[PDB]
Amino acid sequence: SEQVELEFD
Amino acid sequence: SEQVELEFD
Amino acid sequence: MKFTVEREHLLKPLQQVSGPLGGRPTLPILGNLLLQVADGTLSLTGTDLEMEMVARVALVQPHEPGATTVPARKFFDICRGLPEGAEIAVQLEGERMLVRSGRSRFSLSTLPAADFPNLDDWQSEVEFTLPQATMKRLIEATQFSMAHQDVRYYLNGMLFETEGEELRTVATDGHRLAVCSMPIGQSLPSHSVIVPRKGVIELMRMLDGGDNPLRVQIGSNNIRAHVGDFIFTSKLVDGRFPDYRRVLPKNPDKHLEAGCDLLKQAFARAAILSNEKFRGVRLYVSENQLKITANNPEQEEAEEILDVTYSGAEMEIGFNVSYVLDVLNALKCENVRMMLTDSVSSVQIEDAASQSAAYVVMPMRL
Amino acid sequence: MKFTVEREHLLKPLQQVSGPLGGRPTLPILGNLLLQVADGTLSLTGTDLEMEMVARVALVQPHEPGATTVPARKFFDICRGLPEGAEIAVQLEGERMLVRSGRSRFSLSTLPAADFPNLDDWQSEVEFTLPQATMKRLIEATQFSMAHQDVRYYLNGMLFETEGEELRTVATDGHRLAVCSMPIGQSLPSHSVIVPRKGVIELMRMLDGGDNPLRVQIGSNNIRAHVGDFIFTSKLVDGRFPDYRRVLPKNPDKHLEAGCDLLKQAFARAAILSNEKFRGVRLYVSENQLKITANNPEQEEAEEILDVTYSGAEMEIGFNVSYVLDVLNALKCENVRMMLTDSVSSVQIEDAASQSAAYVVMPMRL
Ligand SMILES: *C(=O)c1ccc(-c2c3ccc(=[N+](C)C)cc-3oc3cc(N(C)C)ccc23)c(C(=O)[O-])c1
Ligand SMILES: *C(=O)c1ccc(-c2c3ccc(=[N+](C)C)cc-3oc3cc(N(C)C)ccc23)c(C(=O)[O-])c1
């Protein structure tokens, strides 16, 4: 994805 | 007409 | 084409010439500004095919002749976004124009200067000069009465009329009219032209420092205004503009005078409970008293009573409150005078202390 | 019901309680304010079913008990439209509420006070007090990072968390996060609740008393804030709010520090030539130097070079420039610090002179 998503684990 | 029109003619 | 100009010498010009544009042009080229360097001068031009705004900027730093067109909004934002005092170097390189200031660099897409649409040449038939403050007053006093998208094209603009030593403006939308005249101090031939509304607004907006004089040239199909280092040219609107003298009430038998602020505020409060779409309010005039009422579909009602100076028979007359407020807001004065006849005839409103401007508002039946 | 109060004592209350009103809801009663007169007090309530704003106005002039609901916008406009220092008399008469001031009279349509929707009763589990300025800082520092209409409901709000003697707010939309913590000098039990987005804004808007104390009460499903003579209550959002600690970069091997203004202005100018919808910009970090680049579909490019303090391996990393600018705009400080790891991992940003607030922004693959 062009925008990386926050990884809350 | 509720609003009267200006009469120039 | 190359030039280097201080940010502060480019900002106003860029903002001004971008006036006729819209950010959402119907044609790519109309979204660009034509830049031309020649004989120590940088010329900037913006257009919408109906009118054009040109700015001339003296080039005191080294430069090279040439021309091109670049996106107006982007170029303006770049210059405006640079720090105060920044030196803006520009260099044309074919399909792109480079811009550099400090270590801030940009490349804008261009379109051939030959593709830029310019108005056809014309000849001036009338010419006069006046203080910007005067032209600004003439326009601001009447512009709100211009029609917007009326099938009667000649109403979607403002009449500029010269007579004797006076310049007069007239605007009307069939429901209300505004007229203002001011002495120019020079003998002029009787002439009359209609400036398209978009052009009126653009002109009004180029009038900043009341001091500097304004030079106006009127042709058979164009009008041009020279303001400082700016030159505005617009096509004219065809058609027979109505004669304001014919809507002015004749032999008004009813006269009212009242404080402008009190009147305005009373109409403003009453408007709150007027029909959101039709905005009708009723005026009841009687012995030195004015009663303003308004009601809406929810059966809510407002009533304002004011002490006024009134002479004539008692009467009820309706009005679109927005039209009345427009006049009162345009009249930034102490007292207002109203001249009436019957319940369905024109009402003339003016500053009780000045006849330079006059307003006519047709009532509503109710 | 009857009361008479000075305009200046009614203006702010009316403006504040109208806050939760959409201004065009699909429910007539929700467009009204509940007015209640009892024991020397006029109470005004506005609601949108999820939250309510209550204002209490002492009644020093004669009055009579009772209650009703009237159109919020119209009543406010009428009161604000009256002259400064005006005395506003109100008298309920069935399906209409009359309003009189001087010779300005109004009649508003009412709806039964019994029809007014009130939130259900609840019990407070935790409460503390703090300066309005502190709560205001906590919200303003993070509110821009809340999600808007995410399917993940818990993100469409702000986490309010008490721990030790600190109150912390956290907001995130999955792309960026903001966290702020402030000590309040009161031993507090560990707790966390999510305040609905609209509720966060309404709360932020009732804060204007600077050092004036704010009282907060948190229940299992509601939060309440007592601000002077205003009481704001909102339902809470269910769900597990993410743990900000988990998105903070671990063992950052790259660190950058630069002036906030210069950084902000450089990103601002570069943004001009970034994709209008994706807003991507590229950052290149090298020894004491930052290069920011941007390009759009028209092949236009912007490049900014800045002197910065940078330690770590050279690297290129992409970002949505609006997210970066939001952070820089929220920080009202001299220098900013950035901690990074790799090109596709979290980047932490903060005021180089304060750790009270921290921001995390996820890059974009460019
Ligand atoms: C979003 O636009 C996007 C993000 C990442 C990638 C991508 C990969 C995604 C998922 C993977 N696994 C589940 C194993 C591996 C990926 O490997 C990649 C390798 C490269 N190289 C070597 C240049 C680039 C991108 C990815 C994609 C994608 O479309 O590949 C898209
Ligand atoms: C607009 O809504 C509107 C304006 C006027 C009238 C109206 C008349 C219109 C045209 C007429 N002629 C061409 C002869 C005569 C009219 O007479 C009227 C008489 C009254 N009375 C006696 C209360 C009221 C209105 C008119 C109308 C309309 O619909 O009648 C509408």
mmCIF file of N, CA and C in Angstrom, chain D residues 263-349:
data_model
loop_
_atom_site.group_PDB
_atom_site.id
_atom_site.type_symbol
_atom_site.label_atom_id
_atom_site.label_comp_id
_atom_site.label_asym_id
_atom_site.label_seq_id
_atom_site.Cartn_x
_atom_site.Cartn_y
_atom_site.Cartn_z
ATOM 1 N N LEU D 263 11.653 24.015 8.812
ATOM 2 C CA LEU D 263 11.197 22.697 8.382
ATOM 3 C C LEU D 263 9.784 22.811 7.815
ATOM 4 N N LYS D 264 8.912 23.470 8.570
ATOM 5 C CA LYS D 264 7.521 23.638 8.163
ATOM 6 C C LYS D 264 7.362 24.387 6.842
ATOM 7 N N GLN D 265 8.093 25.482 6.676
ATOM 8 C CA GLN D 265 7.978 26.252 5.445
ATOM 9 C C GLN D 265 8.507 25.479 4.236
ATOM 10 N N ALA D 266 9.517 24.644 4.450
ATOM 11 C CA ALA D 266 10.081 23.857 3.355
ATOM 12 C C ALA D 266 9.079 22.788 2.908
ATOM 13 N N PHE D 267 8.433 22.136 3.868
ATOM 14 C CA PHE D 267 7.441 21.123 3.529
ATOM 15 C C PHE D 267 6.247 21.798 2.867
ATOM 16 N N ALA D 268 5.895 22.985 3.357
ATOM 17 C CA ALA D 268 4.774 23.744 2.807
ATOM 18 C C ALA D 268 4.984 24.084 1.333
ATOM 19 N N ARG D 269 6.177 24.565 0.981
ATOM 20 C CA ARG D 269 6.453 24.910 -0.407
ATOM 21 C C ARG D 269 6.519 23.662 -1.280
ATOM 22 N N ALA D 270 7.175 22.616 -0.786
ATOM 23 C CA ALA D 270 7.290 21.380 -1.551
ATOM 24 C C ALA D 270 5.904 20.794 -1.820
ATOM 25 N N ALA D 271 5.017 20.897 -0.834
ATOM 26 C CA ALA D 271 3.656 20.372 -0.972
ATOM 27 C C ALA D 271 2.935 20.926 -2.198
ATOM 28 N N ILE D 272 3.282 22.145 -2.594
ATOM 29 C CA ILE D 272 2.642 22.779 -3.735
ATOM 30 C C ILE D 272 2.709 21.940 -5.006
ATOM 31 N N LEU D 273 3.802 21.206 -5.187
ATOM 32 C CA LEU D 273 3.960 20.392 -6.382
ATOM 33 C C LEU D 273 3.876 18.892 -6.112
ATOM 34 N N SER D 274 3.198 18.523 -5.027
ATOM 35 C CA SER D 274 2.995 17.117 -4.683
ATOM 36 C C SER D 274 1.635 16.728 -5.264
ATOM 37 N N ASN D 275 1.405 15.429 -5.404
ATOM 38 C CA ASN D 275 0.142 14.936 -5.930
ATOM 39 C C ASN D 275 -0.996 15.531 -5.096
ATOM 40 N N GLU D 276 -1.964 16.142 -5.767
ATOM 41 C CA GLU D 276 -3.081 16.768 -5.081
ATOM 42 C C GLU D 276 -3.884 15.841 -4.169
ATOM 43 N N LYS D 277 -3.939 14.555 -4.487
ATOM 44 C CA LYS D 277 -4.696 13.649 -3.639
ATOM 45 C C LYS D 277 -3.871 12.714 -2.758
ATOM 46 N N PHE D 278 -2.653 12.376 -3.177
ATOM 47 C CA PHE D 278 -1.816 11.487 -2.370
ATOM 48 C C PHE D 278 -0.786 12.235 -1.516
ATOM 49 N N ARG D 279 -0.532 13.493 -1.873
ATOM 50 C CA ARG D 279 0.366 14.377 -1.129
ATOM 51 C C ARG D 279 1.741 13.823 -0.759
ATOM 52 N N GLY D 280 2.275 12.926 -1.576
ATOM 53 C CA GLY D 280 3.563 12.342 -1.251
ATOM 54 C C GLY D 280 4.776 13.223 -1.487
ATOM 55 N N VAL D 281 5.691 13.214 -0.520
ATOM 56 C CA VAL D 281 6.947 13.956 -0.616
ATOM 57 C C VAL D 281 8.040 12.989 -0.183
ATOM 58 N N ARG D 282 9.243 13.170 -0.721
ATOM 59 C CA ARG D 282 10.361 12.308 -0.368
ATOM 60 C C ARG D 282 11.378 13.073 0.474
ATOM 61 N N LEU D 283 11.888 12.415 1.509
ATOM 62 C CA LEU D 283 12.895 13.009 2.373
ATOM 63 C C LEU D 283 14.181 12.218 2.194
ATOM 64 N N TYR D 284 15.291 12.925 2.021
ATOM 65 C CA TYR D 284 16.590 12.285 1.884
ATOM 66 C C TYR D 284 17.461 12.842 2.997
ATOM 67 N N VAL D 285 17.891 11.975 3.907
ATOM 68 C CA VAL D 285 18.728 12.423 5.007
ATOM 69 C C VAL D 285 20.182 11.983 4.850
ATOM 70 N N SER D 286 21.096 12.922 5.067
ATOM 71 C CA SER D 286 22.530 12.662 4.990
ATOM 72 C C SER D 286 23.204 13.546 6.036
ATOM 73 N N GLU D 287 24.512 13.385 6.223
ATOM 74 C CA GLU D 287 25.232 14.168 7.225
ATOM 75 C C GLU D 287 24.841 15.644 7.264
ATOM 76 N N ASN D 288 24.219 16.034 8.374
ATOM 77 C CA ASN D 288 23.768 17.402 8.618
ATOM 78 C C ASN D 288 22.997 18.049 7.469
ATOM 79 N N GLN D 289 22.257 17.237 6.716
ATOM 80 C CA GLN D 289 21.493 17.754 5.585
ATOM 81 C C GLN D 289 20.213 16.977 5.289
ATOM 82 N N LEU D 290 19.144 17.723 5.026
ATOM 83 C CA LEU D 290 17.841 17.155 4.685
ATOM 84 C C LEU D 290 17.421 17.701 3.326
ATOM 85 N N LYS D 291 16.991 16.812 2.445
ATOM 86 C CA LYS D 291 16.531 17.231 1.132
ATOM 87 C C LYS D 291 15.106 16.731 1.009
ATOM 88 N N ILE D 292 14.194 17.635 0.671
ATOM 89 C CA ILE D 292 12.792 17.282 0.522
ATOM 90 C C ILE D 292 12.410 17.467 -0.929
ATOM 91 N N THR D 293 11.825 16.433 -1.519
ATOM 92 C CA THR D 293 11.417 16.514 -2.909
ATOM 93 C C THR D 293 9.949 16.156 -3.081
ATOM 94 N N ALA D 294 9.359 16.694 -4.138
ATOM 95 C CA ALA D 294 7.969 16.431 -4.453
ATOM 96 C C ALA D 294 7.764 16.520 -5.959
ATOM 97 N N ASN D 295 6.896 15.667 -6.484
ATOM 98 C CA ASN D 295 6.559 15.722 -7.899
ATOM 99 C C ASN D 295 5.110 15.283 -8.066
ATOM 100 N N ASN D 296 4.455 15.813 -9.094
ATOM 101 C CA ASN D 296 3.052 15.512 -9.370
ATOM 102 C C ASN D 296 2.903 14.876 -10.746
ATOM 103 N N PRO D 297 1.669 14.509 -11.133
ATOM 104 C CA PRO D 297 1.459 13.891 -12.448
ATOM 105 C C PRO D 297 1.893 14.740 -13.650
ATOM 106 N N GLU D 298 1.943 16.061 -13.489
ATOM 107 C CA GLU D 298 2.360 16.938 -14.586
ATOM 108 C C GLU D 298 3.881 16.993 -14.728
ATOM 109 N N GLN D 299 4.583 16.139 -13.991
ATOM 110 C CA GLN D 299 6.045 16.103 -14.049
ATOM 111 C C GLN D 299 6.699 17.336 -13.433
ATOM 112 N N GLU D 300 5.960 18.070 -12.610
ATOM 113 C CA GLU D 300 6.524 19.248 -11.969
ATOM 114 C C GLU D 300 7.247 18.762 -10.720
ATOM 115 N N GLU D 301 8.302 19.463 -10.322
ATOM 116 C CA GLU D 301 9.078 19.051 -9.157
ATOM 117 C C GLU D 301 9.466 20.209 -8.258
ATOM 118 N N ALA D 302 9.600 19.909 -6.973
ATOM 119 C CA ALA D 302 10.024 20.890 -5.983
ATOM 120 C C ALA D 302 11.145 20.220 -5.200
ATOM 121 N N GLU D 303 12.129 21.003 -4.790
ATOM 122 C CA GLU D 303 13.241 20.464 -4.027
ATOM 123 C C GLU D 303 13.686 21.493 -3.005
ATOM 124 N N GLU D 304 13.769 21.076 -1.750
ATOM 125 C CA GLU D 304 14.195 21.958 -0.667
ATOM 126 C C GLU D 304 15.393 21.342 0.038
ATOM 127 N N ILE D 305 16.435 22.135 0.266
ATOM 128 C CA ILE D 305 17.598 21.640 0.991
ATOM 129 C C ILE D 305 17.695 22.459 2.272
ATOM 130 N N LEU D 306 17.883 21.765 3.386
ATOM 131 C CA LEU D 306 17.966 22.406 4.692
ATOM 132 C C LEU D 306 19.169 21.911 5.476
ATOM 133 N N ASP D 307 19.767 22.801 6.262
ATOM 134 C CA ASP D 307 20.881 22.409 7.115
ATOM 135 C C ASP D 307 20.180 21.866 8.341
ATOM 136 N N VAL D 308 20.582 20.685 8.782
ATOM 137 C CA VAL D 308 19.973 20.091 9.959
ATOM 138 C C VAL D 308 21.062 19.351 10.707
ATOM 139 N N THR D 309 20.722 18.860 11.888
ATOM 140 C CA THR D 309 21.661 18.068 12.662
ATOM 141 C C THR D 309 21.184 16.645 12.421
ATOM 142 N N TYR D 310 21.974 15.867 11.693
ATOM 143 C CA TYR D 310 21.590 14.498 11.399
ATOM 144 C C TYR D 310 22.710 13.499 11.596
ATOM 145 N N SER D 311 22.393 12.429 12.315
ATOM 146 C CA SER D 311 23.336 11.357 12.585
ATOM 147 C C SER D 311 22.654 10.052 12.182
ATOM 148 N N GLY D 312 23.398 9.180 11.512
ATOM 149 C CA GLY D 312 22.849 7.907 11.081
ATOM 150 C C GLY D 312 23.143 7.646 9.617
ATOM 151 N N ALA D 313 22.752 6.474 9.126
ATOM 152 C CA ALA D 313 22.985 6.132 7.728
ATOM 153 C C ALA D 313 22.111 6.991 6.820
ATOM 154 N N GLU D 314 22.577 7.224 5.598
ATOM 155 C CA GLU D 314 21.808 8.014 4.649
ATOM 156 C C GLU D 314 20.577 7.189 4.310
ATOM 157 N N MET D 315 19.447 7.853 4.101
ATOM 158 C CA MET D 315 18.227 7.125 3.788
ATOM 159 C C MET D 315 17.179 8.000 3.123
ATOM 160 N N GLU D 316 16.297 7.355 2.365
ATOM 161 C CA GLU D 316 15.198 8.031 1.689
ATOM 162 C C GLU D 316 13.927 7.479 2.314
ATOM 163 N N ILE D 317 12.994 8.362 2.654
ATOM 164 C CA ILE D 317 11.743 7.927 3.259
ATOM 165 C C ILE D 317 10.620 8.842 2.784
ATOM 166 N N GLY D 318 9.486 8.239 2.437
ATOM 167 C CA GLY D 318 8.355 9.008 1.945
ATOM 168 C C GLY D 318 7.318 9.320 3.004
ATOM 169 N N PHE D 319 6.576 10.404 2.793
ATOM 170 C CA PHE D 319 5.546 10.827 3.732
ATOM 171 C C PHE D 319 4.413 11.584 3.064
ATOM 172 N N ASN D 320 3.242 11.516 3.689
ATOM 173 C CA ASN D 320 2.076 12.266 3.246
ATOM 174 C C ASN D 320 2.433 13.616 3.870
ATOM 175 N N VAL D 321 2.711 14.621 3.045
ATOM 176 C CA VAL D 321 3.108 15.924 3.576
ATOM 177 C C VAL D 321 2.076 16.587 4.494
ATOM 178 N N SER D 322 0.788 16.310 4.292
ATOM 179 C CA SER D 322 -0.235 16.898 5.157
ATOM 180 C C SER D 322 -0.090 16.377 6.586
ATOM 181 N N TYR D 323 0.239 15.096 6.727
ATOM 182 C CA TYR D 323 0.429 14.517 8.055
ATOM 183 C C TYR D 323 1.629 15.165 8.739
ATOM 184 N N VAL D 324 2.693 15.409 7.981
ATOM 185 C CA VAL D 324 3.880 16.031 8.552
ATOM 186 C C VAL D 324 3.540 17.456 8.974
ATOM 187 N N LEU D 325 2.919 18.213 8.074
ATOM 188 C CA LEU D 325 2.550 19.591 8.381
ATOM 189 C C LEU D 325 1.594 19.683 9.572
ATOM 190 N N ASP D 326 0.687 18.721 9.712
ATOM 191 C CA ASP D 326 -0.239 18.745 10.848
ATOM 192 C C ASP D 326 0.570 18.723 12.140
ATOM 193 N N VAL D 327 1.560 17.838 12.190
ATOM 194 C CA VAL D 327 2.410 17.722 13.366
ATOM 195 C C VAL D 327 3.188 19.018 13.616
ATOM 196 N N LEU D 328 3.853 19.516 12.582
ATOM 197 C CA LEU D 328 4.645 20.735 12.730
ATOM 198 C C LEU D 328 3.789 21.937 13.143
ATOM 199 N N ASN D 329 2.546 21.974 12.667
ATOM 200 C CA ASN D 329 1.632 23.059 13.010
ATOM 201 C C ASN D 329 1.139 22.939 14.448
ATOM 202 N N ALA D 330 1.017 21.707 14.939
ATOM 203 C CA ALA D 330 0.555 21.468 16.301
ATOM 204 C C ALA D 330 1.661 21.810 17.295
ATOM 205 N N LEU D 331 2.906 21.666 16.858
ATOM 206 C CA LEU D 331 4.046 21.989 17.698
ATOM 207 C C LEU D 331 4.270 23.491 17.523
ATOM 208 N N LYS D 332 4.199 24.239 18.614
ATOM 209 C CA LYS D 332 4.416 25.681 18.549
ATOM 210 C C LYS D 332 5.749 25.834 19.246
ATOM 211 N N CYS D 333 6.816 25.380 18.595
ATOM 212 C CA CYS D 333 8.128 25.431 19.225
ATOM 213 C C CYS D 333 9.264 25.787 18.282
ATOM 214 N N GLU D 334 10.436 26.004 18.868
ATOM 215 C CA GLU D 334 11.634 26.383 18.124
ATOM 216 C C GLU D 334 12.270 25.268 17.301
ATOM 217 N N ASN D 335 12.580 24.151 17.946
ATOM 218 C CA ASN D 335 13.218 23.040 17.251
ATOM 219 C C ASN D 335 12.425 21.746 17.353
ATOM 220 N N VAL D 336 12.546 20.910 16.328
ATOM 221 C CA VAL D 336 11.851 19.630 16.297
ATOM 222 C C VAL D 336 12.856 18.495 16.169
ATOM 223 N N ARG D 337 12.542 17.379 16.817
ATOM 224 C CA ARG D 337 13.384 16.196 16.800
ATOM 225 C C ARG D 337 12.615 15.059 16.122
ATOM 226 N N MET D 338 13.306 14.296 15.284
ATOM 227 C CA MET D 338 12.700 13.164 14.594
ATOM 228 C C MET D 338 13.560 11.930 14.825
ATOM 229 N N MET D 339 12.918 10.827 15.187
ATOM 230 C CA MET D 339 13.617 9.570 15.420
ATOM 231 C C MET D 339 13.085 8.558 14.419
ATOM 232 N N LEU D 340 13.988 7.964 13.645
ATOM 233 C CA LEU D 340 13.604 6.999 12.628
ATOM 234 C C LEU D 340 14.404 5.703 12.712
ATOM 235 N N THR D 341 13.950 4.715 11.947
ATOM 236 C CA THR D 341 14.628 3.430 11.830
ATOM 237 C C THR D 341 14.755 3.171 10.329
ATOM 238 N N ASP D 342 13.779 2.494 9.732
ATOM 239 C CA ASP D 342 13.856 2.222 8.301
ATOM 240 C C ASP D 342 12.837 3.009 7.468
ATOM 241 N N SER D 343 12.911 2.847 6.149
ATOM 242 C CA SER D 343 12.048 3.558 5.206
ATOM 243 C C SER D 343 10.548 3.286 5.266
ATOM 244 N N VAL D 344 10.148 2.190 5.895
ATOM 245 C CA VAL D 344 8.732 1.875 5.959
ATOM 246 C C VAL D 344 8.232 1.732 7.385
ATOM 247 N N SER D 345 9.014 2.226 8.338
ATOM 248 C CA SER D 345 8.629 2.137 9.738
ATOM 249 C C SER D 345 8.293 3.476 10.379
ATOM 250 N N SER D 346 7.647 3.406 11.537
ATOM 251 C CA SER D 346 7.231 4.582 12.284
ATOM 252 C C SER D 346 8.336 5.605 12.467
ATOM 253 N N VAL D 347 7.941 6.867 12.444
ATOM 254 C CA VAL D 347 8.864 7.957 12.677
ATOM 255 C C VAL D 347 8.214 8.750 13.798
ATOM 256 N N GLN D 348 8.992 9.036 14.834
ATOM 257 C CA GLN D 348 8.493 9.787 15.966
ATOM 258 C C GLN D 348 8.972 11.219 15.844
ATOM 259 N N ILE D 349 8.066 12.152 16.108
ATOM 260 C CA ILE D 349 8.375 13.565 16.016
ATOM 261 C C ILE D 349 7.943 14.263 17.298
#
